[PDB]
Amino acid sequence: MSLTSWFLVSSGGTRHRLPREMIFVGRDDCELMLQSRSVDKQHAVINYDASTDEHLVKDLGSLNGTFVNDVRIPEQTYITLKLEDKLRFGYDTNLFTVVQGEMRVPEEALKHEKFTIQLQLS
Template identity: 30%
Template sequence: MSPKRPSSIQPSARPRSGSRSKSPPPIDKAKPNFANSGLLAAETNAVKLTDGTSTILKYNEPPEARKPTLGWRLYVFKGSEQAELLHIHRQSAYLIGRDRTVTDILIEHPSCSKQHAVIQHRQVTEKDEFGASKPKNKPFIIDLESTNSTYVNDEAIPTSRFYELKAGDVIKFGLSNREYVLLHDDAT
């Protein structure tokens, strides 16, 4: 038989308090801190400008980013008049917004964010009618948490998520009345 512990040491006799949260130990500033600071990521996303300042980009291309194989174009309409024709097949991503220093497609409407959205060409895997998987390059759009949203066919798309675009889609940014119609070489 083992001897009994005194009741003051037994777990059931300990006083219980409502909160058991402990404050974190004080940080010793003399020791090195190897925790993630986020400065390295910010540095890789920074674009240095000629005046010495820098702009942090909100977007990084994903690993599946590919330059498109089709000749994609954006037809820009203001009302019923065609204002511009933008070729968006020369690189894998196009940053859209008001910031002249970093955007590929400039939108000057005040309701649009400085870095509003990105059109990203990505390689995705699709199954054909026989069930075989094959890679295919497709355009997507992603809203970069803009204040006034991005619209595809008059529907607001979710923020920070890729939304697949199809030939004939009409894209609008913020409250601008310009419409961007997406077509490619093979579209009729």
């Protein structure tokens, strides 16, 4: 099949699918892992608003902050991510671009009952 989703595209060349649920961003035991010392162990969350089909970033109270279009966002405040926004956590070298697109669901993933049901209900 083909899935429609928001993604983060790193300046480092990687692509990261934003799921329709909350994820953590950080240096330690997070869904989106970064390696920089300038990023907190649990730095931010990227949540999803099902009503507006948008993602929102919240800095959890990190040492160096979270930047949207080079602006340090207020801490513990949800900021809506818009198409072409430039997102950086702390002073990590990954500059992420907020994009939306169609991705290919591998045929192997459709053998998973729970995944397929959540895909069909999407």
